[PDB]
């Protein structure tokens, strides 16, 4: 699967503190994966079927800054560590996976696409182990099948003595 990724920053920190306080986003949203930030931590979101989905341990119950004001969380499932907002116009939704393939590809905030082997509903193993510091801030990022459809979003790193060896994720069916 020749899946690649490229990260584009659309905002600085000053513009982030300001847009955070107001709740009003002037910018035009594009893409399927969004890079999110509260002023103090940064993580990912994936738009699937109308909703911008991310992790609770990242977003909390916070509103998302939108074109015409703060967008309230329509969906919150603390049991699953999942939140969603209705996607702002411009944010294209990804197509949920069909092939039921077990060969997955995790997209990180650093625009890398990591091969992952599915082990259960919520579990896949990293074919190559990764440093913990390398994966931090990538929760909410999608796991894609070889054709390129969403099977879930990254939730937690499964570690073996300080090094990530597997990923735990929220399946698409859960959303």
């Amino acid at each position: 699967a020749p899946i690649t990724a490229y990260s584009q920053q659309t905002r600085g920190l000053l513009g982030c503190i300001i847009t955070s306080l107001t709740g009003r986003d002037k910018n035009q949203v594009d893409g399927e994966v969004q890079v999110l930030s509260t002023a103090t931590q940064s993580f990912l979101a994936t738009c699937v079927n109308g909703v911008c989905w991310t992790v609770y341990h990242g977003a909390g119950s916070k509103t998302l800054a939108g074109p015409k004001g703060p967008i309230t969380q329509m969906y919150t499932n603390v049991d699953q560590d999942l939140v969603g907002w209705p996607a702002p116009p411009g944010a294209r939704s990804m197509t949920p996976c069909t092939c039921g393939s077990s060969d997955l590809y995790l997209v990180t905030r650093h625009a890398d696409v990591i091969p992952v082997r599915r082990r259960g509903d919520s579990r896949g193993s990293l074919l190559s182990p990764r440093p913990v510091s390398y994966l931090k801030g990538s929760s909410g990022g999608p796991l894609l099948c070889p054709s390129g459809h969403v099977v879930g979003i990254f939730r937690a790193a499964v570690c073996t003595r300080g090094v990530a060896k597997a990923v735990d994720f929220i399946p698409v069916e859960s959303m």
Partner: peptide, 13 residues
């Protein structure tokens, strides 16, 4: 405060 879209990840292939 709100959560803010500060960037995006463009996918390909």
């Amino acid at each position: 405060g709100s959560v803010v879209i500060v960037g995006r990840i463009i996918l390909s292939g």
